[PDB]
Amino acid sequence: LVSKSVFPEQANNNEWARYLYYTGRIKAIQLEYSEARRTMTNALRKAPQHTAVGFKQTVHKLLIVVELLLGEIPDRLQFRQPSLKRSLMPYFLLTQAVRTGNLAKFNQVLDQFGEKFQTDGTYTLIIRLRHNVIKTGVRMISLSYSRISLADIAQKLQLDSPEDAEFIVAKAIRDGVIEASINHEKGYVQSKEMIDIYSTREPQLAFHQRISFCLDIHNMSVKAMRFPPKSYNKDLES
């Protein structure tokens, strides 16, 4: 049903926030979390202060779990600022658990808050974090450094074995949200980096993407602008 929806560009503000939000819930379980988290963050902002309130609550609660699924580490400011921090408190616990890299705290929280999560529709997404607990912790360590031992990853993160940590990193680079190549000779995990991106198209490609995105705003604006004054002319304006 989501795929069939073209969902028009000229739609009310509440419509925009709600569609992105549903599409995000659907994508999150799927292992399309990069896209889900962007629409869900957007959805919260876009939703009003009055009519939106029931659904609105639900977007902020679900989104915190969804962002973790990508490997984002959500801030404290996010919890404090709408002033919902109390209701958000359990999700906050998952945020800590994901970061540390140790499974025992993540499994315990999942079952205990299990009933509460199911309402909001989070529970299906909570169980997916078990891959993510480890992923988020290996992700900070692989990107930051160049060649680091599987042995460093395992001591810090509290993983079972370096060998265990070696399979886990392998699977992630296949998913491509940590992007690396592993050399299990000496036994390090190696970062991808070219130390010049000018030789490659990437600064150009980045700019070019914006140019398409920008052009879409111009075409959308020319058509939209005349429509309300036109409507008023036939109906007669005082």
């Binding site: 580490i73 959500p74 801030d75 404290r76 906050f92 945020t95 800590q96 970061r99």
Partner: peptide, 24 residues
């Protein structure tokens, strides 16, 4: 969330004096 750096303050000052000798 909260920065691990704070907890690090007390621990980092002390480490410095010992470490220099311990390791080259």
């Amino acid at each position: 969330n909260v920065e691990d750096d704070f907890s690090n303050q007390l621990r980092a000052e002390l480490e410095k004096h010992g470490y220099k000798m311990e390791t080259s």
